[PDB]
Amino acid sequence: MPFEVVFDGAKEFADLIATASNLIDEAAFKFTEEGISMRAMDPSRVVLIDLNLPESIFSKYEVEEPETIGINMDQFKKILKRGKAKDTLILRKGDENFLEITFEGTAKRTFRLPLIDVEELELELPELPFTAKVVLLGEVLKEGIKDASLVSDAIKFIAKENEFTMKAEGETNEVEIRLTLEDEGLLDLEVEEETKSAYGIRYLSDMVKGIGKADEVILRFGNEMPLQMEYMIRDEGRLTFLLAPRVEE
């Protein structure tokens, strides 16, 4: 139960947990000898967020025993609003339900909070054949989704051999973006067959606005199977969103 994690500057982790809170409120961080893990489902059982951070991310990391703790997303969002980019985040926990967040600098800050428990059921996602993989930049996808957000909500991604297309249909508007290997927004392609699927972009737009511009993304999808967008944190941690498309035309 007791642990201590010290890191000089955690604005990335702050905005990450802010996006997780905007996604869902009930979340439990499992602390194991390897690091931290979290898996948040959806109240409408349509979206799944997963994150893992090993012990090669923060500066100081001392854990006693692997367990599962819970932190309120509202109480955390009421905490990250004071995180300076040049601060030293220190998360301390003992045996009692007291969580300490410490910051060292021009004034020693220390906030104590109660620790409630979360009992969300965890189940391993079954393996599914992707048949479509691609690695792109985050800024291009973010600006495309922000340009196609106001016209409609169903954005259609089509992928063929060395070809990608992001389109936005409708009745009084149409948007189209082409992507090839010699373009300025595609890093690499691993397409297998001709796939095409339309997805909603509310949670998409929120989660891609929460992520910075220089970060990269890896999309895995198929014909009509759910999409998985993954990315890496400091080349050590992993974070993946997963959500199914719509059946309509």
Partner 1 sequence: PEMKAYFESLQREIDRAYAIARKARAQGKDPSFDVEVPQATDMAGRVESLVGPPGVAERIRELVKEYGKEIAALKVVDEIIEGKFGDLGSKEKYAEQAVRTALAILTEGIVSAPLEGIADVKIKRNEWADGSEYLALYYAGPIRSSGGTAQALSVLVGDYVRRKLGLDRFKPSDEHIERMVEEVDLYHRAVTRLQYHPEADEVRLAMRNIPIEITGEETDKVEVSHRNVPGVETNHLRGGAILVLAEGVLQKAKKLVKYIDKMGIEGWDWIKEFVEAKEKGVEKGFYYELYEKFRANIAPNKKYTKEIIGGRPLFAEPSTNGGFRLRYGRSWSVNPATMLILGCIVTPATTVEGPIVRLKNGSVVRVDDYETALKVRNEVDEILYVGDALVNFGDFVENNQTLLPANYVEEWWVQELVQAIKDLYEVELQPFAENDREAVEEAAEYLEVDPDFLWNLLKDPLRVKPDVETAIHLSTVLDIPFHPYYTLYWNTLQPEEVEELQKALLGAQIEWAEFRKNRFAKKVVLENDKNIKRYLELLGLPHRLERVEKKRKVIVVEYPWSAALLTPLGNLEWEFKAKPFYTVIDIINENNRIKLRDRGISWIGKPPVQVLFPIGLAGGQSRDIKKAAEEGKTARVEIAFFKCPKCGHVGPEHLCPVCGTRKELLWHCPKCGADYPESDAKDFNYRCPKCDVELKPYAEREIKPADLLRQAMDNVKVYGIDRLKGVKGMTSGYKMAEPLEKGLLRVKNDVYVFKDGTIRFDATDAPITHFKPKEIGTSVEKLRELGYTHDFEGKPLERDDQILELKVQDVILPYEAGRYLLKVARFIDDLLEKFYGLPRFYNAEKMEDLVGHLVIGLAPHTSAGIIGRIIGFSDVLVGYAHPYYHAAKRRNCDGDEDAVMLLLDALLNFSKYYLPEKRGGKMDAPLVVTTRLDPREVDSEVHNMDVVRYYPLEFYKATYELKSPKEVKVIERVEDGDMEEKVARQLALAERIRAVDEHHVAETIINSHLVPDLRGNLRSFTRQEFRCVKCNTKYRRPPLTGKCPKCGGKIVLTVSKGAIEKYLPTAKMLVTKYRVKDYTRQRICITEKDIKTLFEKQRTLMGFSADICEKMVKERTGHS
Partner DNA sequence: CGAACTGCCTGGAATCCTGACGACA
Partner DNA sequence: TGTCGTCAGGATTCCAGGCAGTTCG
243 Cβ contact partners less than 8 Å away, ≥ 6 residues apart: 46, 47, 48, 199, 203, 226, 227
Instruction: Give the shortest CB-246-to-partner 1 separation in angstroms.
Output: 5
Task: Compute the radius of gyration of the chain from its Cα atoms.
Answer: 20
Instruction: Give the shortest CB-149-to-DNA separation in angstroms.
Output: 9
Q: At what angle do helices 202-210 and 11-23 cross, to 10 degrees?
A: 170
Q: Which of 83, 144, 222, 226 binds partner 1 (CB under 8 A)?
A: 226
Q: How many binding residues for DNA (CB under 7 A)?
A: 2
Q: Does 128 bind partner 1 (CB under 8 A)?
A: yes
Binding mask of the shown chain, residues 213 to 232, with x at each position contacting DNA by CB under 7 A: x-------------------
| CA–CA separation, 240 and 39 (whole Å) | 10
Q: Which of 81, 108, 126, 161 binds partner 1 (CB under 8 A)?
A: 126
Which one, of 185, 209, 201, 197, lies nearest residue 249 by Cα? 197
State the CB neighbour count (10 A cutoff) for residue 62: 11
200 vs 210, which CB is nearer to partner 1? 200
185 vs 245, which CB is nearer to partner 1? 245
Instruction: Give the shortest CB-102-to-DNA separation in angstroms.
Output: 21
Instruction: Give the shortest CB-36-to-partner 1 separation in angstroms.
Output: 25
Are the C-beta atoms of residues 52 and 237 closer than 8 Å to each other? yes
**Which of 76-84, 173-181, 204-212, 239-247 is the region at the interface with partner 1 (rule: CB under 8 A)?**
239-247
24 vs 191, which CB is nearer to DNA? 24
Instruction: Give the shortest CB-49-to-partner 1 separation in angstroms.
Output: 14
Written as one letter, the residue type at 190 is E
Q: Does 244 bind partner 1 (CB under 8 A)?
A: yes
**Stretch 171-200 residues interacting with partner 1 (CB under 8 A):** 200
Residues paired with residue 237 on neighbouring β-strands, in sequence order: 233
Q: Which residues in this chain contact partner 1 in the complex, by CB under 8 A?
A: 45-46, 126, 128, 200, 226, 244-248
Q: Which residues in this chain contact DNA in the complex, by CB under 7 A?
A: 81, 213
